[PDB]
Design a protein around this ligand. Structure first.
Ligand SMILES: [Ca+2]
Ligand SMILES: [Ca+2]
Lengths: 490, 490
């Protein structure tokens, strides 16, 4: 049945348009391919199945996004008429009412969600990622338990990270490449497609630069000479992962945190409100949620949109499972580390990962022609990374969520002194922009009102609650995950 | 050798004045007493031995405290002449210069340390406690590994915690009991001994109330009826521990955090500076470090200062090892959870624990007359608590250390604009008290200078860095402990 070993893995692992729609034969992969090869699919099967509860709620958070802001309209009106104000000292009879309508359309996607919708799903997903950490740990105690029964100097690396983390203008060059590849100055779909193009300019060159680090890490680990060939690869991954970590996520880390930070431009209100790209592209909306919304979409989708044994010598060799491990944990850190801005990040992984099983199943049958049946153990070298990413999960998204949806639910608690918490708690969408542009550019300029001097002290009050949210978050969610670590495996 | 079983544990475990000075025969305890009984002494042996590196540095932090503030005198002068100012609107020819000299003596102990001495040892000890968590884990993998080879409704509880955490005026009554048991109004040694007395009034009654919770927890767990008698005791500890946790540490949790918080008294500078206990006891120094210094001393020391078998029926029974487990983890949480104010908390545990081996060794030979040789396994039901206390360690002392020694190393970075970071960085001891009384009573009253309104916004700036220190702390020290969790057991 060596032919039927191919055929049952040809036919039942054929489809590559969508689901197989028969079953998911993870056992058949372990019947043939091997416990190294099978525990990649067993994980990616379990990862696909556990994205289904996550993706449905991402639709419900879309539905609680879409319906509860179209029906009662509490955060379109307050959010379109926020951005109707954000250019009122830009007008002065020169290019008056342009980017507001662009800004009023960004707020339909961004400010659809902020305070209930982003936050409740993130606390869910960080618990879910810890649950998925726990459920896979029980699945390790069910699949590897089933598998164990069937078995019967280093400153050069820190130099290269300063190189690789110094490779950020390379993103800004690609952010400038699409600024001249098409160069439109419009508001309907210009900024949507130009930032779509630059991510595509990134993903082409980053994958070219992803192959650079492999030739960097292989010669560098051969220079260090570890004696054991097992820990040689273990040093090789942790070298090359951290290279590919800081290759792949540093565009996002730039645009989540550092692209918005570190900038305060002088010339108060008359010159603060205008001077971004000469008043035409986007001082209507800075809104860095969308640049994280648009990037992870193209980062999630275009893994697809780019891609008797005498003939077996004519083809590329096997053992590409350590990039394959890596290729999905780059996507696991897209889901879990960054689910605050857009919550359908499971489904853009889910629609992806349905093909990505069958894309990689077909890549292991009709390509990469040596199914060795290696059957080694211990995927845990990435599970150590995954928990560490999961430890970074409750840190990083708490540093994502507590800089976007904590402007407003404390500005409930300044201007609503008399009457409300929620109902006229939507009135403090706008006046936070009348305060100004809520970042470091925006809590500073009320000194021409009162006579950066004193009003940049209300910046600290949010920055208190910014830091107070995280210290509540990574303590509760590490305590909520202290529940889930004990409930499941017994 | 049944007599010699007694005699070798009589004679080699006799001394009870200090060290045995022969050896520490942990094996002989496991040769006779049992792996339940022995792994208490094996832990308390390892806990005593690992306090020796901690206690020496506590002397060095005392030496870096004592010498570097007596020789160069940079934080006596700046700290005595801080407190020479803190009553200058109290004087007004009525009880002028009294409590300054009391305050100038509190600052010799408190402000001996703050910014280098407390902080460097805490980061050391929180790493050390994680190291001691790791070293005992390797000792578990060496002692229990040696031992495993030789082996061949619940709302009623949450009601009672609201009772027990509601039992805090009981501390304040004992804080008022010593206020009338002697009632002096002096400054040399009145506040030192009155607060020494009230802790003694606590430790008498708390131990009386510690026995109350056992009769509470035993009937309450018998009311819940767990079927398995093993998990019956496991529910019993976690009921009674959390009772004795909130019995014992809630005086400290009160005086660390909540006794200083939640109080802002109106009537600015003329009435703010004076109105604590009518200007005679201690508006010279509030200084809640000492109340945590003095309490843990009496909490650490006075475990001592209060305390052919026909005759065996005339004595109290065995199986008091679950309070004995508890009695030391109350002391482990004295060391690790609270080492920021006074750093010799290892040595006041160390001098204690040298006797506390021989006190409890003699209590198991000449008293409690049944050494059953039970030899059961798994101390880990408290190791789960201990890591949880150790997880609370990096939280709580970061909430201890970042409210005392973060007044000043950011007030380096207000008034030293021109010339210094450290040398005239001692000049901002005083002006923080000229700001006022650095807590919530103290960042508020500059509104009669400028015309609570606006100057309570520099409170947030510290409260930023208060929260910013913790979020640096419990992330770095959980990353520094990510090193130590991998270095030792391989
Ligand atoms: Ca793939
Ligand atoms: Ca004892």
């Amino acid at each position: 049945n060596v032919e039927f070993n191919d055929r049952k893995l040809l036919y039942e692992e054929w489809a590559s348009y969508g689901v197989f729609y028969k079953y998911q034969p993870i056992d058949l992969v372990r019947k043939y391919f091997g416990e190294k090869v099978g525990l990649y699919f067993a994980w990616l099967g379990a990862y696909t199945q556990m994205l289904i509860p996550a993706s449905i709620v991402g639709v419900i958070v879309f539905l609680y996004g879409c319906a509860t802001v179209d029906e009662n309209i509490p955060s379109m009106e307050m959010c379109d008429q926020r951005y109707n104000i954000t250019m009122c000292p830009l007008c002065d009879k020169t290019c008056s009412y342009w980017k507001m309508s662009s800004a009023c359309a960004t707020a339909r996607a961004s400010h659809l969600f902020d305070n209930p919708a982003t936050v409740f799903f993130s606390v869910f997903m960080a618990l879910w990622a810890a649950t998925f950490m726990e459920h896979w740990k029980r699945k390790q105690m069910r699949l590897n338990y089933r598998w164990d029964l069937t078995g019967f100097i280093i400153f050069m690396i820190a130099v290269t990270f300063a190189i690789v983390l110094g490779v950020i203008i390379y993103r800004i060059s690609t952010a400038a490449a699409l600024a001249m590849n098409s160069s439109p100055s419009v508001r309907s779909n210009i900024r949507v497609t130009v930032t779509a193009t630059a991510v595509i300019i990134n993903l082409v060159v980053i994958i070219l630069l992803d192959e650079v680090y492999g030739c960097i890490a292989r010669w560098l680990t051969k220079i260090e000479v570890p004696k054991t060939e097992k820990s040689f690869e273990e040093r090789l991954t942790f070298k090359a992962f951290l290279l590919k970590f800081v290759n792949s996520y540093t565009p996002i880390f730039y645009v989540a945190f550092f692209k918005g930070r570190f900038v305060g431009r002088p010339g108060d209100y008359v010159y603060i409100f205008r001077s971004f790209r000469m008043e035409e592209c986007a001082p209507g909306g800075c809104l860095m949620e969308l640049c994280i919304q648009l990037s992870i979409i193209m980062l999630g989708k275009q893994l697809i949109q780019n891609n008797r044994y005498e003939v077996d010598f004519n083809l590329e060799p096997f053992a590409g499972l350590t990039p394959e491990y890596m290729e999905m944990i780059i996507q696991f850190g897209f889901v879990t580390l960054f689910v605050a801005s857009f919550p359908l990040a499971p489904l853009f992984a889910l629609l992806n990962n349905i093909i990505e099983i069958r894309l990689d199943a077909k890549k292991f049958v009709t390509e990469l022609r040596r199914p060795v049946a290696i059957r080694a153990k211990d995927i845990g070298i990435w599970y150590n990374i995954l928990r560490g990413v999961g430890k970074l999960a409750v840190i990083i998204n708490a540093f994502v969520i507590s800089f976007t949806s904590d402007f407003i639910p404390r500005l409930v608690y300044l201007y609503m002194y008399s009457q409300n918490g929620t109902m006229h708690g939507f009135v403090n969408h706008t006046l936070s922009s009348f305060n100004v542009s809520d970042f470091q550019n925006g809590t500073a300029p009320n000194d021409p009102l009162d006579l950066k001097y004193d009003i940049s002290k209300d910046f600290w009050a949010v920055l208190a609650a910014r830091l107070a949210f995280v210290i509540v978050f990574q303590n509760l969610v590490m305590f909520m995950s202290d529940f889930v670590d004990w409930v499941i495996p017994d």
